[PDB]
């Protein structure tokens, strides 16, 4: 009676990814943001390899596979970053990468202090709720299937079945090692609330990156190849209401 599903998620979990930032140089808006964009491109490559290895993922239509990756990367990366911050610096700072750790001073220099405050808060939730490594892994996987277009995907049916199974697994991690049914229901309630709080944060970051892309030539900020294309084509659909997140609560 081994955790086949959990074994897989643990086995495919990406490793450490550096941004290539030079902490030796004085912090400047352009340098910090250029480093974040580069980190995004690097983690994006890792999110693709991780996703392809997820149970059932290759069952979706190829066009849908690219759609969920293009729409949910922000949320996925913010959630993982929140976990890294918690486990590494106990949510004291934002652990984007080993060579890119944000303190209060960098949060201000990046011109996105408010958004950083919410990310730090999410990170603190991992501690306040005592989120376990297993629960973390399952929630992150579910985040890949939490945002889609209102007009539906090419094969909406396969997607619905896939998302339904992942919610079921999360239920399994909570159900097991817990006799009291009231505590199970309470736990599911708390975790679904946690997952929903990720969406508002991702939207604010979407708006911010989109605006920066438009005026990137003025602030001397560079956007990688894939990043610039996703933000100019996919992100706008999110901001115009064409693509929306799936919330458990209202």
């Amino acid at each position: 009676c081994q955790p086949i599903f959990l074994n897989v998620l643990e086995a495919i979990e990406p490793g450490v990814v550096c941004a290539g930032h030079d902490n030796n140089q004085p912090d400047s808006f352009a340098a910090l943001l250029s480093s974040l964009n580069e980190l995004g491109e690097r983690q994006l490559v890792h999110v693709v390899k991780w996703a392809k290895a997820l149970p059932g993922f290759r069952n979706l239509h190829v066009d849908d596979q690219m759609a969920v990756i293009q729409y949910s990367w922000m949320g996925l990366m913010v959630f993982a970053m929140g976990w890294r911050s918690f486990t590494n610096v106990n949510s004291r700072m934002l652990y984007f990468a080993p060579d890119l750790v944000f303190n209060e001073y960098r949060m201000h220099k990046s011109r996105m202090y408010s958004q950083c405050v919410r990310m730090r808060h999410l990170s603190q939730e991992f501690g306040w709720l005592q989120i376990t490594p297993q629960e973390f892994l399952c929630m992150k996987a579910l985040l890949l299937f939490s945002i889609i277009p209102v007009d539906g995907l090419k094969n909406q049916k396969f997607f619905d079945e896939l998302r339904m199974n992942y919610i079921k697994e999360l239920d399994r991690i909570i159900a097991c090692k817990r006799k009291n049914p009231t505590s199970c229901s309470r736990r599911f309630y708390q975790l679904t609330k946690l997952l929903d709080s990720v969406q508002p944060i991702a939207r604010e970051l979407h708006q911010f990156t989109f605006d920066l892309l438009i005026k990137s030539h003025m602030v001397s900020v560079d956007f990688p190849e894939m990043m610039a294309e996703i933000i100019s084509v996919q992100v706008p659909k999110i901001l115009s209401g064409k693509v929306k997140p799936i919330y458990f609560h209202t």
């Binding site: 490559v45 693709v48 390899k49 392809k52 190829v62 596979q65 690219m66 894939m226 294309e229 996703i230």
Partner: peptide, 14 residues
Amino acid sequence: KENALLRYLLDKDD
């Protein structure tokens, strides 16, 4: 697909 690079990353074996 549209995002040529991304599309390549998906169908490429690693």
